[PDB]
Amino acid sequence: MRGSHHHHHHGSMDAQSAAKCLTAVRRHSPLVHSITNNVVTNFTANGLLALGASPVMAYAKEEVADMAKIAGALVLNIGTLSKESVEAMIIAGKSANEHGVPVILDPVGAGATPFRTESARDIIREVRLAAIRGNAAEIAHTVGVTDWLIKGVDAGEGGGDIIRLAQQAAQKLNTVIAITGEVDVIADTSHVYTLHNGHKLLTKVTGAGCLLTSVVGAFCAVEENPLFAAIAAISSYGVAAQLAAQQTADKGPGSFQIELLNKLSTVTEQDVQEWATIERVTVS
Amino acid sequence: MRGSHHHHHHGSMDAQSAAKCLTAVRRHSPLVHSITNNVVTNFTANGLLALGASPVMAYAKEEVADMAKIAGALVLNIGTLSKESVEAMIIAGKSANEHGVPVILDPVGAGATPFRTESARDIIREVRLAAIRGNAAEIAHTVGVTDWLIKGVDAGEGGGDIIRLAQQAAQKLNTVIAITGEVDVIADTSHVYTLHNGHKLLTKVTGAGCLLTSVVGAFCAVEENPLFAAIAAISSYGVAAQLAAQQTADKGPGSFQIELLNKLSTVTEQDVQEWATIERVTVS
Amino acid sequence: MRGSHHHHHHGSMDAQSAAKCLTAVRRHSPLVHSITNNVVTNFTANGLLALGASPVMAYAKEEVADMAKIAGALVLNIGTLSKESVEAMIIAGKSANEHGVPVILDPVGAGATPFRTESARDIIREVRLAAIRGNAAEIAHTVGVTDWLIKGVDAGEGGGDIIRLAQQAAQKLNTVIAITGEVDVIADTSHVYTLHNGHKLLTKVTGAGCLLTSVVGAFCAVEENPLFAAIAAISSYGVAAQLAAQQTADKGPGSFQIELLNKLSTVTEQDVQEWATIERVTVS
Numbered sequence: 001m002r003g004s005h006h007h008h009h010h011g012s013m014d015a016q017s018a019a020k021c022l023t024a025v026r027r028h029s030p031l032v033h034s035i036t037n038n039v040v041t042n043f044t045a046n047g048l049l050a051l052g053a054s055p056v057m058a059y060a061k062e063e064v065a066d067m068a069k070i071a072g073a074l075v076l077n078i079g080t081l082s083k084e085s086v087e088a089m090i091i092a093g094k095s096a097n098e099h100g101v102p103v104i105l106d107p108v109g110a111g112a113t114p115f116r117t118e119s120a121r122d123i124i125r126e127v128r129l130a131a132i133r134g135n136a137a138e139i140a141h142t143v144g145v146t147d148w149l150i151k152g153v154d155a156g157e158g159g160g161d162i163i164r165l166a167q168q169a170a171q172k173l174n175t176v177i178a179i180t181g182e183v184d185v186i187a188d189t190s191h192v193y194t195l196h197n198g199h200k201l202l203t204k205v206t207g208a209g210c211l212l213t214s215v216v217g218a219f220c221a222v223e224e225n226p227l228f229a230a231i232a233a234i235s236s237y238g239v240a241a242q243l244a245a246q247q248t249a250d251k252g253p254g255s256f257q258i259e260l261l262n263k264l265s266t267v268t269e270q271d272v273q274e275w276a277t278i279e280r281v282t283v284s
Numbered sequence: 285m286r287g288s289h290h291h292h293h294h295g296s297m298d299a300q301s302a303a304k305c306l307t308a309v310r311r312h313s314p315l316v317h318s319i320t321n322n323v324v325t326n327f328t329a330n331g332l333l334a335l336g337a338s339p340v341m342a343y344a345k346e347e348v349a350d351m352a353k354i355a356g357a358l359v360l361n362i363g364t365l366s367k368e369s370v371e372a373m374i375i376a377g378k379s380a381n382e383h384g385v386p387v388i389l390d391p392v393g394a395g396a397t398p399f400r401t402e403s404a405r406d407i408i409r410e411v412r413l414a415a416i417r418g419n420a421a422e423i424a425h426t427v428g429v430t431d432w433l434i435k436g437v438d439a440g441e442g443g444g445d446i447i448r449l450a451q452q453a454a455q456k457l458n459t460v461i462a463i464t465g466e467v468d469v470i471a472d473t474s475h476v477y478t479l480h481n482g483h484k485l486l487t488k489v490t491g492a493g494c495l496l497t498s499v500v501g502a503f504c505a506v507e508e509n510p511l512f513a514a515i516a517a518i519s520s521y522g523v524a525a526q527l528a529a530q531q532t533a534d535k536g537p538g539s540f541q542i543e544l545l546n547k548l549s550t551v552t553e554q555d556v557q558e559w560a561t562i563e564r565v566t567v568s
Numbered sequence: 569m570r571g572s573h574h575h576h577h578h579g580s581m582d583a584q585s586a587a588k589c590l591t592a593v594r595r596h597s598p599l600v601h602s603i604t605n606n607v608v609t610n611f612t613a614n615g616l617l618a619l620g621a622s623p624v625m626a627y628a629k630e631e632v633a634d635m636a637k638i639a640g641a642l643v644l645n646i647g648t649l650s651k652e653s654v655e656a657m658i659i660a661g662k663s664a665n666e667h668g669v670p671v672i673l674d675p676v677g678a679g680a681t682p683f684r685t686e687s688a689r690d691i692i693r694e695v696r697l698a699a700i701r702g703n704a705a706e707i708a709h710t711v712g713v714t715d716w717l718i719k720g721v722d723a724g725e726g727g728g729d730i731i732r733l734a735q736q737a738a739q740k741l742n743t744v745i746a747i748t749g750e751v752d753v754i755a756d757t758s759h760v761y762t763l764h765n766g767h768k769l770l771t772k773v774t775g776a777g778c779l780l781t782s783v784v785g786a787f788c789a790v791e792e793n794p795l796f797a798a799i800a801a802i803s804s805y806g807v808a809a810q811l812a813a814q815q816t817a818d819k820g821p822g823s824f825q826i827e828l829l830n831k832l833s834t835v836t837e838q839d840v841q842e843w844a845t846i847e848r849v850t851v852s
């Protein structure tokens with residue numbers, strides 16, 4: 001089911017190709033194996049079901065190798081990590097690597113404690129990753145940006161710094177780096193894009209980001225290029241979120257959470273084509 | 285308190301009696317002890333509360349025997365099992381057995397990985413179960429395929445193939461077998477029934493089956509005969525699910541999940557007596 | 569971010585001051601580190617985000633000390649405790665004590681099993697707590713090392729005994745004791761208050777109490793006096809609950825839960841000032 005829905009020889013990844021990827025997810029219902037934190041398990045599963053994917057949660061070292069080998073994508077999330085779960089994530093990741101199943105990492109809280117930072121690097125060192133999704137601070141700490149410079153990530157300013165961070169981190173780790181924030185930045189070793197969809201309400205629902213990383217996995221299961229896969233995932237999620245906010249912005253984060261689940265199931269190819277905002281960044 | 289709300293010497297289980305058990309659950313608010321997966325814990329607890337029962341979750345080997353013996357029912361779910369949690373489930377089940385507390389099992393994933401099939405089997409070997417609730421494949425692979433026939437060529441589900449599986453499994457494991465899905469069959473050693481109350485939207489809510497097994501536990505806490513208890517539980521859940529679906533319409537799986545919790549609370553004894561569809565199967 | 573929003577010199581704690589603390593919580597978005605049960609993690613995080621706080625969940629002994637020292641408050645909840653989690657809770661509490669981070673305890677199920685009663689007591693013995701939040705029975709079983717320690721009249725149920733229970737527990741443990749029920753009673757070593765806000769629908773939402781404890785934590789992060797912080801937290805929460813009920817009372821527990829999250833976000837200073845019912849108990 002891992003097809004090719006876009007190629008740079010035809011131009012920059014765009015809304016139409018993103019919309020195609022979404023339909024492929026609905027069509028193939030990829031099995032997405034998540035080894036995530038216990039604050040977002042139920043939400044992640046429900047979000048994936050709403051979207052049209054097949055979620056599976058298995059954490060036991062006695063069975064993670066077997067589950068990951070048959071999955072369409074593997075997503076590792078250290079939100080509530082333990083030494084045991086980190087072990088399982090690497091066992092699952094190696095099985096995934098051996099079988100060609102793309103692996104996505106969400107380094108939740110990397111930088112907050114040495115344990116999270118090191119566990120994130122342990123995974124990167126022991127597992128080949130198709131992509132890493134996180135906020136600017138988490139990415140900077142994970143890749144090793146020098147202490148004193150990290151501050152350069154604070155506040156909310158853009159136009160190059162965050163864009164360069166993404167490309168430099170991608171070049172260093174040889175993977176796709178997706179930094180979400182006021183403006184989202186996605187890059188691989190030689191290409192960079194900025195995405196402009198979503199709604200601030202997402203910052204008021206726990207797991208909004210964790211679920212997003214799982215959605216990136218679902219798209220990575222049907223699109224061979226993780227960059228394009230991630231761009232389509234984030235754009236689709238963002239449109240779904242904007243549509244959800246229109247119906248609940250005035251009600252509150254509770255109604256919005258529920259409506260996001262509804263929209264992930266009702267958002268159409270037409271919606272993405274019409275509202276997705278994807279911009280290629282001139283790199284040179 | 286567990287009593288008898290129906291006897292075979294009073295006819296075959298019917299909606300009338302099912303509604304009576306629902307009222308009994310709400311009147312006694314039985315304590316239902318769950319040792320389940322972290323993907324459905326919150327949803328399971330909220331569903332039981334809405335229904336009218338009192339949920340409690342306890343997993344540590346240092347207390348499961350103590351919590352189980354004071355419960356009205358113990359429910360074991362292997363959704364996100366670990367070697368340690370299964371050992372805890374058995375310790376809990378044995379305490380329940382020694383104190384006369386009904387034990388219900390949900391063999392989630394049995395047949396998907398060897399670890400899961402064997403874990404389900406270990407529990408069955410060490411714990412006397414009042415009932416087992418799961419899908420056809422999970423029941424078949426846990427008991428082991430003996431009878432293969434059902435129907436040739438993809439045409440119809442038949443129904444007799446599942447009825448056969450249910451009763452055979454009930455006889456082999458000497459327990460109540462509740463198989464749910466498109467079919468829906470419940471049976472014990474000498475009796476078999478078919479229920480017809482559900483909705484496809486349940487396939488869009490994670491833990492929809494896990495919560496259903498917990499509800500079966502709530503009913504077994506007040507109805508002495510597990511066959512009657514399971515039938516009442518599933519019928520009531522099914523009616524609630526139908527009402528939730530009506531109210532939901534085309535809103536989405538998020539709205540439906542919320543409405544299911546609402547209806548488990550507002551569904552009435554009269555609603556059950558009216559929509560519960562219970563068919564006793566005449567096999568010979 | 570921990571300032572003082574009231575002083576007994578200006579009289580007793582009142583709605584006006586409660587309102588100010590709420591605003592303080594939203595201004596600082598205090599980081600609330602919770603080591604809680606797996607049935608309420610998502611609800612707890614979502615509730616804190618809606619309120620305006622910043623939740624973080626960390627449980628591994630490899631990081632709980634590092635996470636606690638940078639938090640605004642530490643919340644310990646034994647709902648689904650394990651030998652490992654209790655150990656981690658104490659490690660986190662000691663670290664928090666070393667840095668002046670307020671620690672709140674929710675002795676869930678204390679008295680139901682010896683392991684929980686013992687565990688609750690081990691934490692109290694090893695960690696200086698700012699406050700303990702639970703129901704009458706849990707507080708009674710926790711402090712009642714002997715059946716005579718807490719002096720009072722033994723009879724059916726309890727009420728006026730609650731105020732006396734609170735006073736004695738607060739004096740014996742040297743901390744703030746918040747007992748919630750149809751009527752809430754909060755006390756420290758020298759003052760006693762009863763609160764009268766909220767709605768019975770809260771008994772139908774799992775984690776309603778666990779979240780409240782976390783909210784007490786968020787307020788303690790911005791108000792140096794734990795008694796005052798606890799009153800403001802419980803009053804604000806109750807008001808949000810009444811407002812949510814008014815719009816959900818006849819829909820069901822599912823709708824209510826969602827509306828509670830909405831209201832924790834939309835409830836204003838004015839709402840608290842007008843609805844919060846705080847009464848100082850003339851004791852002497």
Ligand SMILES: Cc1ncsc1CCO
Nearest residue numbers: 037079206207623624625
């Ligand atoms: C806030 C939080 N803390 C640990 S995991 C988590 C969920 C990410 O949204």
Ligand SMILES: Cc1ncsc1CCO
Nearest residue numbers: 045055057323363490491
């Ligand atoms: C998605 C999931 N993972 C383990 S159990 C479960 C719920 C089945 O609906």
Ligand SMILES: Cc1ncsc1CCO
Nearest residue numbers: 339340341605647774775
């Ligand atoms: C009911 C329950 N059982 C274990 S923790 C818990 C959450 C408190 O509401």
Ligand SMILES: [Cl-]
Nearest residue numbers: 038321322606
């Ligand atoms: Cl967990």
